[PDB]
CSV table of C-alpha atoms and ligand atoms in Angstrom, one decimal:
chain,number,residue,atom,x,y,z
A,1,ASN,CA,68.0,84.6,108.8
A,2,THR,CA,67.6,83.3,112.4
A,3,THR,CA,64.1,83.9,113.8
A,4,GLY,CA,61.7,82.5,116.4
A,5,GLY,CA,64.1,82.5,119.3
A,6,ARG,CA,65.0,85.0,122.1
A,7,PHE,CA,68.0,86.3,123.9
A,8,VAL,CA,68.4,85.0,127.4
A,9,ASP,CA,70.5,86.1,130.4
A,10,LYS,CA,71.5,83.0,132.4
A,11,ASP,CA,74.4,82.0,134.5
A,12,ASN,CA,76.1,85.3,133.9
A,13,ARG,CA,76.2,84.6,130.2
A,14,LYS,CA,74.0,85.6,127.2
A,15,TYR,CA,72.5,82.9,124.9
A,16,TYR,CA,70.1,82.9,122.0
A,17,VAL,CA,67.6,80.1,122.6
A,18,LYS,CA,65.1,78.9,120.0
A,19,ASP,CA,62.7,76.1,120.8
A,20,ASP,CA,65.0,75.2,123.8
A,21,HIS,CA,68.3,74.8,121.8
A,22,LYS,CA,71.2,77.3,121.9
A,23,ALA,CA,72.5,79.2,118.9
A,24,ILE,CA,76.2,78.5,118.2
A,25,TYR,CA,78.7,80.3,116.0
A,26,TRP,CA,77.4,83.0,113.5
A,27,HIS,CA,73.8,84.2,113.3
A,28,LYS,CA,72.0,87.0,111.6
A,29,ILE,CA,69.2,88.1,113.9
A,30,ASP,CA,66.9,91.1,113.4
A,31,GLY,CA,69.2,93.0,111.1
A,32,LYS,CA,72.3,92.5,113.2
A,33,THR,CA,75.0,89.8,113.4
A,34,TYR,CA,76.1,87.8,116.5
A,35,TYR,CA,78.5,85.0,117.3
A,36,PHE,CA,77.9,82.4,120.0
A,37,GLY,CA,81.0,80.2,119.8
A,38,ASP,CA,81.0,76.4,120.3
A,39,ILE,CA,78.6,76.1,123.2
A,40,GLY,CA,76.4,79.3,122.9
A,41,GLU,CA,78.0,82.1,124.9
A,42,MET,CA,77.5,85.4,123.0
A,43,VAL,CA,80.8,87.1,122.4
A,44,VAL,CA,81.7,90.8,122.8
A,45,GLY,CA,84.6,93.1,121.9
A,46,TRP,CA,87.6,91.9,119.9
A,47,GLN,CA,87.4,88.3,118.5
A,48,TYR,CA,89.7,86.2,116.3
A,49,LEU,CA,87.1,83.9,114.6
A,50,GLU,CA,86.5,81.6,111.7
A,51,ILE,CA,85.1,83.6,108.8
A,52,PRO,CA,81.3,83.8,108.4
A,53,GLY,CA,79.1,83.1,105.3
A,54,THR,CA,80.1,79.5,104.2
A,55,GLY,CA,77.3,77.8,106.0
A,56,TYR,CA,79.7,75.6,108.1
A,57,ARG,CA,79.7,78.1,111.0
A,58,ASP,CA,76.3,79.8,110.2
A,59,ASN,CA,72.7,79.4,111.4
A,60,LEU,CA,73.6,76.5,113.6
A,61,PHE,CA,72.2,75.3,117.0
A,62,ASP,CA,73.9,73.1,119.6
A,63,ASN,CA,71.7,70.1,118.8
A,64,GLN,CA,73.2,70.0,115.2
A,65,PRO,CA,76.4,68.4,114.0
A,66,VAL,CA,79.4,70.7,113.3
A,67,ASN,CA,81.7,70.1,110.3
A,68,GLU,CA,85.3,69.5,111.4
A,69,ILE,CA,86.5,71.9,108.6
A,70,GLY,CA,89.2,74.2,109.8
A,71,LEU,CA,88.2,77.6,108.3
A,72,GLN,CA,90.5,80.6,108.0
A,73,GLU,CA,90.3,83.1,110.9
A,74,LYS,CA,90.2,86.9,111.1
A,75,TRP,CA,89.7,89.7,113.6
A,76,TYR,CA,86.2,91.0,114.2
A,77,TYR,CA,84.9,93.7,116.6
A,78,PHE,CA,81.6,93.2,118.4
A,79,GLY,CA,79.8,95.8,120.5
A,80,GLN,CA,79.1,95.2,124.2
A,81,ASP,CA,75.5,94.2,123.1
A,82,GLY,CA,77.1,91.4,121.0
A,83,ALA,CA,76.3,93.1,117.6
A,84,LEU,CA,79.1,92.8,115.0
A,85,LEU,CA,80.5,96.1,113.9
A,86,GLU,CA,79.8,95.9,110.1
A,87,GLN,CA,82.5,98.3,109.1
A,88,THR,CA,84.1,98.2,105.6
A,89,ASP,CA,86.4,101.2,105.7
A,90,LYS,CA,87.9,102.2,109.1
A,91,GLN,CA,87.0,103.1,112.6
A,92,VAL,CA,88.8,104.3,115.8
A,93,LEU,CA,88.4,101.5,118.4
A,94,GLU,CA,89.8,100.5,121.7
A,95,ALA,CA,93.2,98.9,121.1
A,96,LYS,CA,93.2,95.1,121.1
A,97,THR,CA,95.5,93.8,123.8
A,98,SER,CA,96.2,90.7,125.8
A,99,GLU,CA,93.4,91.6,128.2
A,100,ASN,CA,90.4,92.4,126.0
A,101,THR,CA,90.0,89.7,123.3
A,102,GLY,CA,88.0,86.5,123.3
A,103,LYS,CA,85.7,87.7,126.0
A,104,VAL,CA,82.0,86.7,126.3
A,105,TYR,CA,79.1,88.6,127.6
A,106,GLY,CA,79.2,88.5,131.4
A,107,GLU,CA,83.0,88.4,131.8
A,108,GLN,CA,84.3,91.5,133.5
A,109,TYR,CA,87.1,93.3,131.7
A,110,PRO,CA,88.0,97.0,131.0
A,111,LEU,CA,87.9,98.5,127.5
A,112,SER,CA,91.4,99.8,126.5
A,113,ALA,CA,91.9,103.4,127.4
A,114,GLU,CA,94.1,103.7,124.3
A,115,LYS,CA,92.3,103.9,121.0
A,116,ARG,CA,93.7,103.1,117.5
A,117,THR,CA,92.5,103.3,113.9
A,118,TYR,CA,91.6,99.9,112.5
A,119,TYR,CA,90.9,99.3,108.8
A,120,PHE,CA,88.3,96.8,107.6
A,121,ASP,CA,87.7,94.8,104.5
A,122,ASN,CA,84.4,94.5,102.5
A,123,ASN,CA,83.3,91.5,104.7
A,124,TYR,CA,83.7,93.3,108.1
A,125,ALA,CA,87.1,91.7,109.1
A,126,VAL,CA,90.1,93.7,110.1
A,127,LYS,CA,92.2,94.5,107.0
A,128,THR,CA,95.8,93.5,106.5
A,129,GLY,CA,98.6,94.4,104.1
A,130,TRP,CA,99.2,97.7,102.4
A,131,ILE,CA,96.8,100.6,102.6
A,132,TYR,CA,97.1,104.2,101.3
A,133,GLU,CA,96.0,107.2,103.3
A,134,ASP,CA,96.7,110.9,103.0
A,135,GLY,CA,99.7,110.7,100.7
A,136,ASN,CA,101.4,107.7,102.4
A,137,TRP,CA,101.5,103.9,102.5
A,138,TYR,CA,101.1,102.0,105.7
A,139,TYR,CA,101.5,98.3,106.3
A,140,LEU,CA,99.0,96.4,108.4
A,141,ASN,CA,100.5,93.2,109.8
A,142,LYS,CA,99.4,90.0,108.0
A,143,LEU,CA,100.8,87.6,110.7
A,144,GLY,CA,101.7,87.4,114.3
A,145,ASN,CA,105.4,87.9,115.4
A,146,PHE,CA,108.1,85.3,115.2
A,151,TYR,CA,101.6,82.3,116.6
A,152,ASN,CA,99.5,84.8,118.7
A,153,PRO,CA,97.2,86.7,116.3
A,154,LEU,CA,97.3,89.9,118.4
A,155,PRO,CA,99.6,91.8,116.0
A,156,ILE,CA,97.4,91.1,112.9
A,157,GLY,CA,95.9,94.3,111.5
A,158,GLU,CA,98.1,96.6,113.6
A,159,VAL,CA,100.1,99.4,112.0
A,160,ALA,CA,103.7,98.1,111.4
A,161,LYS,CA,106.6,100.2,112.7
A,162,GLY,CA,110.3,99.9,111.8
A,163,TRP,CA,111.8,97.1,109.7
A,164,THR,CA,109.1,94.9,108.2
A,165,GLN,CA,109.1,92.1,105.7
A,166,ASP,CA,106.1,91.7,103.4
A,167,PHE,CA,105.4,88.0,103.1
A,168,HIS,CA,102.9,86.7,100.5
A,178,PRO,CA,113.8,86.6,100.1
A,179,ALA,CA,110.6,88.6,100.9
A,180,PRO,CA,111.2,92.4,100.5
A,181,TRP,CA,112.0,94.6,103.5
A,182,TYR,CA,110.4,98.0,104.1
A,183,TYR,CA,110.9,100.6,106.8
A,184,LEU,CA,107.9,102.3,108.4
A,185,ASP,CA,108.5,105.4,110.4
A,186,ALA,CA,107.2,106.2,113.9
A,187,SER,CA,103.6,106.8,112.7
A,188,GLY,CA,103.8,103.9,110.2
A,189,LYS,CA,104.6,105.9,107.0
A,190,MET,CA,106.6,103.9,104.4
A,191,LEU,CA,109.9,105.5,103.6
A,192,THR,CA,111.4,105.9,100.1
A,193,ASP,CA,114.7,106.7,98.6
A,194,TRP,CA,117.9,107.1,100.8
A,195,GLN,CA,117.3,106.9,104.5
A,196,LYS,CA,119.7,106.6,107.5
A,197,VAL,CA,118.6,104.0,110.0
A,198,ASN,CA,120.7,103.0,113.0
A,199,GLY,CA,123.7,104.9,111.6
A,200,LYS,CA,123.7,103.2,108.2
A,201,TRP,CA,122.3,104.2,104.8
A,202,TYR,CA,119.6,102.1,103.0
A,203,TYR,CA,118.0,102.7,99.6
A,204,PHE,CA,114.3,102.1,99.3
A,205,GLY,CA,113.7,103.4,95.8
A,206,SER,CA,110.3,104.6,94.6
A,207,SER,CA,108.4,101.4,95.6
A,208,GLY,CA,109.7,101.3,99.2
A,209,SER,CA,111.4,97.9,98.8
A,210,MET,CA,114.9,97.8,100.4
A,211,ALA,CA,117.6,97.5,97.8
A,212,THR,CA,120.4,94.8,98.0
A,213,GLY,CA,123.5,94.4,95.9
A,214,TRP,CA,124.8,96.8,93.3
A,215,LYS,CA,122.4,99.7,92.5
A,216,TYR,CA,122.8,102.5,90.0
A,217,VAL,CA,121.1,105.6,91.5
A,218,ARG,CA,121.3,109.1,90.1
A,219,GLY,CA,124.3,108.4,87.9
A,220,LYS,CA,126.5,106.6,90.5
A,221,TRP,CA,127.0,103.0,91.6
A,222,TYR,CA,126.4,102.1,95.2
A,223,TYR,CA,126.8,98.7,96.9
A,224,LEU,CA,124.1,97.7,99.4
A,225,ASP,CA,124.8,94.6,101.5
A,226,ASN,CA,123.4,91.6,99.5
A,227,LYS,CA,121.4,90.3,102.5
A,228,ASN,CA,121.0,93.2,104.9
A,229,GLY,CA,120.8,96.3,102.6
A,230,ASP,CA,123.3,98.6,104.5
A,231,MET,CA,125.4,100.8,102.2
A,232,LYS,CA,129.1,100.0,102.1
A,233,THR,CA,132.0,102.5,101.9
A,234,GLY,CA,135.7,102.2,101.4
A,235,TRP,CA,137.5,99.2,99.8
A,236,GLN,CA,135.2,96.3,99.2
A,237,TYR,CA,136.0,92.8,97.8
A,238,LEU,CA,133.0,91.7,95.8
A,239,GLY,CA,132.8,89.0,93.1
A,240,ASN,CA,136.6,88.3,93.2
A,241,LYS,CA,137.4,92.0,92.5
A,242,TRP,CA,138.2,95.1,94.6
A,243,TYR,CA,136.1,98.3,94.3
A,244,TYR,CA,136.7,101.6,96.1
A,245,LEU,CA,133.6,103.4,97.3
A,246,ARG,CA,134.0,107.0,98.7
A,247,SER,CA,132.5,108.1,102.0
A,248,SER,CA,129.2,109.0,100.3
A,249,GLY,CA,129.0,105.4,99.0
A,250,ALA,CA,129.6,106.3,95.4
A,251,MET,CA,131.9,104.0,93.4
A,252,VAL,CA,135.1,105.6,92.1
A,253,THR,CA,136.5,105.1,88.6
A,254,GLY,CA,139.9,106.2,87.4
A,255,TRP,CA,143.0,107.0,89.5
A,256,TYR,CA,142.6,107.1,93.2
A,257,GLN,CA,145.3,107.9,95.8
A,258,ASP,CA,145.2,106.3,99.2
A,259,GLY,CA,147.9,108.0,101.2
A,260,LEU,CA,150.9,108.1,98.8
A,261,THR,CA,149.8,105.0,96.9
A,262,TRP,CA,147.9,105.1,93.6
A,263,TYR,CA,145.2,102.6,92.4
A,264,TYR,CA,143.4,102.5,89.1
A,265,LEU,CA,139.7,101.5,89.1
A,266,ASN,CA,138.5,100.4,85.7
A,267,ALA,CA,136.6,103.0,83.7
A,268,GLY,CA,133.0,101.9,83.7
A,269,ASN,CA,133.0,98.7,85.7
A,270,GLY,CA,135.1,100.1,88.6
A,271,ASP,CA,137.1,96.9,89.4
A,272,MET,CA,140.7,97.6,90.6
A,273,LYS,CA,143.3,96.8,88.0
A,274,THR,CA,146.4,94.6,88.6
A,275,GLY,CA,149.3,93.8,86.3
A,276,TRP,CA,150.1,95.8,83.2
A,277,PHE,CA,147.3,98.1,82.0
A,278,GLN,CA,147.0,101.0,79.5
A,279,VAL,CA,145.3,104.3,80.2
A,280,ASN,CA,145.2,107.0,77.4
A,281,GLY,CA,148.0,105.3,75.4
A,282,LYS,CA,150.5,105.0,78.3
A,283,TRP,CA,151.4,101.8,80.2
A,284,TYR,CA,151.3,101.2,84.0
A,285,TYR,CA,151.9,98.3,86.3
A,286,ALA,CA,150.0,97.5,89.5
A,287,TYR,CA,151.2,95.0,92.1
A,288,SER,CA,148.7,92.3,93.4
A,289,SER,CA,147.6,94.8,96.1
A,290,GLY,CA,146.6,97.3,93.4
A,291,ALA,CA,149.5,99.6,94.3
A,292,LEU,CA,151.0,101.4,91.3
A,293,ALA,CA,154.7,100.8,90.7
A,294,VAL,CA,156.6,104.1,90.5
A,295,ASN,CA,160.3,105.1,89.9
A,296,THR,CA,161.5,101.5,89.6
A,297,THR,CA,161.6,98.6,87.2
A,298,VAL,CA,159.2,95.7,86.7
A,299,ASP,CA,160.6,92.7,84.8
A,300,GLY,CA,163.1,94.8,82.8
A,301,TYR,CA,160.8,97.7,82.0
A,302,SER,CA,161.4,101.1,83.6
A,303,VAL,CA,158.6,103.2,85.1
A,304,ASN,CA,158.9,106.9,85.9
A,305,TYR,CA,157.5,108.9,88.9
A,306,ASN,CA,154.0,108.8,87.4
A,307,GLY,CA,154.3,105.1,86.8
A,308,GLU,CA,154.4,105.4,83.0
A,309,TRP,CA,156.4,102.9,81.0
A,310,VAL,CA,159.3,104.7,79.4
A,311,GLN,CA,160.8,102.6,76.6
B,1,CHT,C1,104.3,99.7,98.7
B,1,CHT,N1,103.5,99.4,97.5
B,1,CHT,C2,102.0,99.2,97.8
B,1,CHT,C3,103.5,100.5,96.5
B,1,CHT,C4,104.0,98.2,96.8
B,1,CHT,C5,104.0,96.9,97.6
B,1,CHT,O1,103.5,95.8,96.9
B,2,CHT,C1,116.5,94.3,109.0
B,2,CHT,N1,117.6,94.3,108.0
B,2,CHT,C2,117.1,94.4,106.6
B,2,CHT,C3,118.4,95.6,108.3
B,2,CHT,C4,118.5,93.2,108.2
B,2,CHT,C5,117.9,91.9,108.4
B,2,CHT,O1,118.7,90.8,107.9
B,3,CHT,C1,125.0,109.7,101.2
B,3,CHT,N1,124.0,109.1,100.4
B,3,CHT,C2,124.3,109.4,98.9
B,3,CHT,C3,124.0,107.7,100.6
B,3,CHT,C4,122.7,109.6,100.7
B,3,CHT,C5,122.5,111.1,100.7
B,3,CHT,O1,122.3,111.6,99.4
B,4,CHT,C1,129.4,97.8,87.2
B,4,CHT,N1,129.3,97.2,88.5
B,4,CHT,C2,130.3,96.1,88.6
B,4,CHT,C3,129.7,98.2,89.5
B,4,CHT,C4,128.0,96.8,88.9
B,4,CHT,C5,127.5,95.5,88.2
B,4,CHT,O1,127.6,95.6,86.8
B,5,CHT,C1,153.6,96.9,78.2
B,5,CHT,N1,154.7,96.0,78.5
B,5,CHT,C2,155.4,95.7,77.2
B,5,CHT,C3,155.7,96.7,79.3
B,5,CHT,C4,154.4,94.7,79.2
B,5,CHT,C5,153.1,94.0,78.7
B,5,CHT,O1,153.3,93.5,77.3
B,6,CHT,C1,142.4,96.7,99.7
B,6,CHT,N1,143.5,96.9,98.9
B,6,CHT,C2,144.4,95.7,98.9
B,6,CHT,C3,143.1,97.2,97.5
B,6,CHT,C4,144.3,98.1,99.3
B,6,CHT,C5,144.7,98.1,100.8
B,6,CHT,O1,143.8,98.9,101.6
B,7,CHT,C1,150.2,110.1,88.4
B,7,CHT,N1,149.2,109.1,88.2
B,7,CHT,C2,149.1,108.7,86.8
B,7,CHT,C3,149.6,107.9,89.0
B,7,CHT,C4,147.9,109.6,88.7
B,7,CHT,C5,147.4,110.9,88.1
B,7,CHT,O1,146.0,111.1,88.5
């Protein structure tokens, strides 16, 4: 809704001048959208800018006061003629890098040789968060790595937290979200149906597995958890019943799986495990005899 002015080439910059004042920030001119920053220099290419449409950064000229309101910022793409790319779906564009953002008309820089697919929201900003395409989920970065906004809107690869104990996801080499059991850096992780990395005890397909409570990696062998011992086989699955480690027998509780100590009964017969879990065999324990199977013979 800006009219009556004209574009001007001056001082190796581009301005829009109306009645001898310069356009600043966002303007809708002649069916296209432009942005002229804080002093009037028309921008081109990739730009991380305050969002348009509020009025506070819109239809303003440099003779007018500017509200000190700090608006939210997003990525936008402008053509080399300054016109905003008004995309609401997706488009393959030169990759944004450290060398091709925040430039104004007149500044010399090369377009990126590498092109990437960028996704856009209904208001022409680069989209972030989860998107679905061709049978897969991809995550578009919401934040910079851990201030610089460059990563925002890029396709996440590898281990990625989704911030609103934020959930972990793993995206493969093309960005596809993995589900179910996956081996990453030599260790097993379970991502279920939703993609969220499991932690703690998890019942999957009729067996118990323990994933590290913080890191998600599947444990095997003997594990001391919640003041009790459990034995997990090499596949990760929790064992119940009798288990022989070398010559030594252990009994893992039916159901819960915790290792028994002291006197315990299995199918009518009595057994004694020392504090280590080791079954007493062919000896006595406090007056009671136990045979080669560890059974109490009265
Ligand atoms: C990965 N999903 C989009 C299915 C859920 C994340 O909120
Ligand atoms: C990235 N992991 C989820 C594997 C560990 C971080 O604590
Ligand atoms: C070995 N896991 C059971 C952890 C995954 C393969 O099914
Ligand atoms: C039964 N487990 C102890 C293995 C899981 C939590 O109930
Ligand atoms: C079963 N015993 C009698 C051997 C000991 C526990 O009461
Ligand atoms: C860990 N336990 C004490 C249960 C057995 C020794 O490996
Ligand atoms: C002989 N035990 C009772 C110790 C184990 C049989 O599975």
